[PDB]
Each structure stands twice: as structure tokens, then as C-alpha cells.
Amino acid sequence: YIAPNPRISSITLTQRITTTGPFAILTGSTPTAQQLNDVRKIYLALMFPG
Amino acid sequence: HNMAIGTLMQREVGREQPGVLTFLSEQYVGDDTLFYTKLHTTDTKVFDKVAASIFDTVAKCGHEASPSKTMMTPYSVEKTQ
Amino acid sequence: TATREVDFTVPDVQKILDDIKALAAEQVYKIVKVPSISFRHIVMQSRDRV
Amino acid sequence: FFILCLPHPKKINNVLRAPYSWFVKMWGVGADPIVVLQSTAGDDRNSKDVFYDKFRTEPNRYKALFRSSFYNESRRMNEEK
DSSP states (O other), rough: OOOOOOTSSBBBOOSSOOOOOHHHHTTOOOOHHHHHHHHHHHHHHSSSSS | HHHHHHHHHHHHHHHSTTTTTTTEEEETTEEEEEEEEEEOOOOOOOOHHHHHHHHHHTTTOOOOOOOTOOOOOOOOOOOOO | SSSSSOOOSOOHHHHHHHHHHHHHOOOOSOSSSSOOOOOOOOOOSOOOOO | OOOHHHHSSSHHHHHHHHHHHHHHHHHHHHHHHEEEEEEEEESSSTTOOEEEEEEEEEEEOGGGGGSHHHHHHHHHHHHHH
């Protein structure tokens, strides 16, 4: 699994003036063991359409 | 006296190895100097010649600053204990 | 947990300006007194034709 | 440490305090991932109005710089001391 490139949602200008994305509290979060098995069901329902 | 010495420090670095080691701050207190600079090359030979011209300026002023006492480091600062 | 992964999302601009400067001293040409050799001869046990 | 001073503790401690102070200055400077406490203040290098952020780590830019002859000469003078 590939996480997206982290500089998509934030640009840094000088040293300390960076853009803050709108979903900054969800991108800096982590899945548990139960919430990652639900992700595997979504990629099990997209590779098998109907 | 540290100010008259420390102004002669920046001249010889700027005249023997120019373009490297620009000076940004000058703090002089009792028996101490503190230069906040930035280094423009991570070289093993060039930095060895810039660090040699600093001691040759103090020794040609009359003082004897020890190479074990002199601090040239990126991530550490001591100032007035 | 805040310092586990090594960070790369802030590109150090000061390092890549010290490498543009060091690229300006790359001497492409060279100054020689005699040009390089361009023809050699081998002897086929002869006195007239090589 | 207490056994070494105990012959002559005012003289031993005055010459052994120099490599003990030097060791704490130059400890975590050469490692390649360096963890700092990200701070932010004014544009001057002497501004005191600082604002602190969380901890983070960053790759060291001065990794190959400590292969120099300035530190290798400075380290054997402290191992002599």
C-alpha cells in the first residue's frame, strides 16, 4: 500500500511559514487493527465489482 | 578588545577564503565571543583551511587561543555558563 | 511517537543553493601544450610499407 | 571519578573539568537523523520572543564534516587531558 506524497497538502515557504491543509487532523491520524481490516474490505469490493 | 579582535577575525576569513562563512551576529561579553554564522560548504579540505585562518588571526594578534577550547559546531551553544 | 519516522517534507533550500554554486567551478575544458595523439603506426617486418 | 581526585582533589578537578565539559557539548552532533525542538522567533539572531513547536527529526547536513582534521586533532588533545 502506498501513502500519497506528503507535500501535496502542505507547501513550506521560508522556514516557518507553511500552508496548513483543511484536513490536518485526519491526515495526522493512525488506524488501529480493527480500522485497517475495514480498509482491506474496500479494496476487496473494488477489485470484484458486483 | 574582543570587538577589535573579532572584527579582524572576519576580514582574514573574507580575504583568504571568500564566499564561505558569512557572519550574521556578534555578541561580546566578558572574556567571551560568540559568532552566529552559517557555513556554505560541507567540505573536508576547505573547512580545514577556513578553521586554520581563524587561529592564525588570534596568534598574530598576540593571544594564544587553544584549539581544544575553540568551539566550531552546528548544534550546540554555550554562552555565559 | 512524534520523532520516529525521518522527515523529508521540508526541502532544505540552503543545501541546494550551495550545490548550484559548486557547479559553477566545474572546469569543462582543459589547457594543454601539446594536443593528444591521433595516429599510430605498426611495422609489418618491412622497410617501405607500414 | 571520586577515586581519581582523592589524591589531590583541588588540582585534579581543575584539569579534569575541561574534558567533562567538552564531552557534553559535542555529543549528539554527528549522527545522521537529528531530533530537535523546533523553535520560531524574530528575524534577528538575538531575538528573545520565541515560540516552540513539537519535537521532530531531520537529516543531518554536516555528517561528512566530522571526518575533518580539526576535530581529529581536537579530540586527541582532550584524550590527552
